[PDB]
Amino acid sequence: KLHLRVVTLIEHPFVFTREVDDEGLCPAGQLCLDPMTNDSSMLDRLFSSLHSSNDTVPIKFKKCCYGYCIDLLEQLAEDMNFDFDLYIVGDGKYGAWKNGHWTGLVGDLLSGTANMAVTSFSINTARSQVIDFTSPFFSTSLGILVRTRGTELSGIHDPKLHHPSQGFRFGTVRESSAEDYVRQSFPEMHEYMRRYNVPATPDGVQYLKNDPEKLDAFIMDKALLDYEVSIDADCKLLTVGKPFAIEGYGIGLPPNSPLTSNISELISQYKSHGFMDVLHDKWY
Template sequence: MESTAFSDENSESPDSSEWNISDFVFLLRNNSKFHLGPIVNISINSSTNTDFQSSLQGYLESIKDSTSTVVTFGCGIKDIRKIFCTVKKFGLELPEYQWILGDSQNVEELRTEDLPMGILAHGKMSEPALDHYVQDALELVARAVGTAAYISPELALLPSTTNCMAKEERRMTSGKYLSRFLANTSFDGLSGYIQSQEETLITSEGHYFIWNLQHDPIGNPMWTRLGRWKEDKVVMDYGIWPDKTQHHRAGDWRHSSRLHLRVVTLVEHPFVFTREVDDDGLCPAGQLCLDPLTNNSAALDSLFLGFHGHNDTIPIEFKKCCYGYCIDLLEKLAEDMGFDFDLYIVGDGKYGAYKNGRWTGLVGDLLRGAAHLAVTSFSINSARSQVIDFTSPFFSTSLGILVRTRDTAAPIGAFMWPLHWSMWLGIFVSLHVTAIFLTLYEWKSPFGMTPKGRNRTKVFSFSSALNVCYAILFGRTAAIKPPKCWTGRFLMNLWAIFCLFCLSTYTANLAAVMVGEKTYEQLSGIHDPKLHHPSQGFRFGTVRESSAEDYVKKSFPEMHEYMRRYNAPATPDGIDRLK
């Protein structure tokens, strides 16, 4: 990394008195990862502003072709603006230089006027209060004691006793045991990152954040947080880091007389509809949009480059006509604010969720710079608000639950609904087993209706036993041959009692099924017991990676664990599953 350092030893910056710039420069020169170029020592003691600008211009001319990164040290915010005013007059614009404010800045004092796009700054949001240090100290002790008590309760909770007459034993005392856990405990507290140094010093590493000056969706400069300094390394917020393509794209906005933005949307009825284009690839009604089926920024750039070329090379299957409430709102917004736009549909069809270290859907396209703004039915939640900015809500909605409406005409097998299939199978298996034993008892009895019985003119066969069992089961008075032996008659009565219980159960469940046909899917809301304690076969879900899923996941984790297998990729798919 090659860089040039701007320093001002006479500045009145409060941070410049806390350290020596020469020592820091010496460390940079001896660091193999950095190549420190010319060092420009700017003195603000010039008699006039003209002398300052002329001297600064001379320094800038000397480093114009020898560096790509410029770092400022020991300069106040007023001095930095003077430098950038001179830089602007000299014509040194980004991305030729990457400017870095080396001194810690206060975010409340950061402004956007006279500063180049892409400049990096770092500093604290605010100084921690005394209450924060006290709470962190108590939490440190609680964490250490809790861990120590979990591993060895007798050492952590029971103080050791000492006998002056006893011989000295080399064993660990409670104090030394707890000190080990205090030295190995670290966490992210209210005042900063709490950790131990050299086993005796507890330090609080302040929350130092990194900001980058970027364009907002309408082209105005704004400070965007990139990450923070934690545990001697930079921790990025959701993997965001500006690149040169973003700076170029932002620069194009400023140099053009009319802004040209790229807008991403998501099909959500009734806010956004789509229809096919005509034979010429045009939209007689609605707004022409692309459906690239990808979230890759390079692929999107290539598609729109071909779309705006002299020869339109975009396949017609990628073209759609977008219309609806949000499209009308976008057209009116472009007319009032004076910008042009290209419209495309998000490739993965998702709103956006943070998964596997990256954002998906609409949020991911905005963070990667593939789109400048998103216009659709887009819900605001805390996770999304941390990485993107939302306008004021233009349409207020609430979460609702769609339920399936069943047909009034019952199918031909509806009479079997009151009992489970295993119950039906058990009844008919028991019926045939009972018929077999009735036949055996009748034929083995000397009083039975068999050819070898006592002059019986009728014969009790297996078909006669089936006739008896079916007549008792269905409660029909049919012409049957009742068995004559006492064992068979006793078994027949047992079968009749069993059928009575089955008939009672069937009748009770039949009434419940008939009533449940009208009330089973009536839900009172998100707290309905049917959702928190679903019965067998009751399925419900929501749209994947939507604000509704995020709400259920945070508020009702057990419900989310059950329903995620039934979640639909998009709203139309979920509605189709209900039909």
């Protein structure tokens, strides 16, 4: 039985977290750590302390993880007969090339801090040069979230984005695939957005949705924005414009991992036997 350490990132409805229950258990999900570290030795020590008969892990690090990607991970673990430790990425980022290294999930796979990454993780060309991805389990365009009766946009080529009016505020999630697409296709746009980008999806959604309104538009994976629109109780939000920058979501592994092809085979069996449809129905 193989023993993997899996890194994840909280992103609804793919991965959610909540506090652990009265007995320190997670009936509806998976026990995970949120330790704010990229140090493999620190993670070794914490998981060791978690599994032993004298668990001294700071309570604030213990969480229960659940969601579409957690259900997928549990099925994979059963079918491939591995067990796993699960932790949330310390910097909260998917990963970008910054200051001569990869951050986020990508950085943890390249440093050996994690054996596998499971979340709403986009397969793009830059990441594919340095880590392995499995076959995709989901596919999404990038999207543009605006308020109803607010900013109107045709898509990523709208002149309002390329020649912004004074006070026009739009941004994406820092160190995301979305930010890399803008950086590489529209460098001037990327520069303009820097002061408006946010650390994580919920922040952009809150900045656009709630008052006081801090963003006029928010660019991020459409699958994530559509989930937020679907739970909007007040006809306040919508996604606008033509599709752009479509990418799959895949599981991330170190380059040339022997596990990649076996996980890909199972993802293809799950797709072709309706399991992905069950997960979509459960979480969307």
